[PDB]
Design a protein around this nucleic acid. Structure first.
Length: 133
DNA sequence: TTTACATGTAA
DNA sequence: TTTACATGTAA
């Protein structure tokens, strides 16, 4: 095919393959991280060219608010505040980050970790604390 | 009310 | 310098 030489879009190859929206795509080959075509599509539409928002929508696709609130972001170091906070799932985080650094080669590791920490930080400012003494 | 991005801290 | 973090801001 006349298309092999091209760099191509920096997205999931099957993403635009006309197919079942509920089909589970492996986000990055050999990571065992899956997402539905429809949901990955939804992440890309929402983000457009904003790699920062693409990171945020992918992370919210795997991690709900309570998981985010109880996580220390990437966990390169342990938490400053609450040592019971576990890192966000390391296998999911690497695949998501690898997928976004591949979607936007100027995205740096440290910007990506800073966004992941902010997700958790936002989840904690929203989660309502207990009203017990 | 929520959150993407900004600001600046503590260790 | 780095990184998890709470908070400020704008929409």
């Amino acid at each position: 095919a006349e298309l092999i030489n091209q760099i191509g879009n920096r997205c999931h190859p099957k993403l635009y393959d006309e197919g079942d929206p509920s089909e589970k795509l492996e986000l990055v080959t050999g990571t065992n991280v899956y997402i539905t075509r429809a949901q990955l599509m939804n992440c890309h539409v929402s983000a457009g060219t904003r790699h920062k928002v693409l990171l945020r929508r992918l992370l919210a696709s795997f991690f709900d608010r309570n998981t985010l609130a109880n996580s220390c972001g990437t966990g390169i170091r342990s938490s400053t505040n609450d040592p019971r906070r576990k890192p966000l799932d390391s296998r999911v985080l690497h695949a998501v980050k690898y997928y976004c650094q591949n979607f936007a080669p100027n995205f740096k590791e440290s910007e990506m970790n800073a966004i992941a920490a902010d997700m958790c930080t936002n989840a904690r400012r929203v989660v309502r604390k207990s009203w017990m003494p």
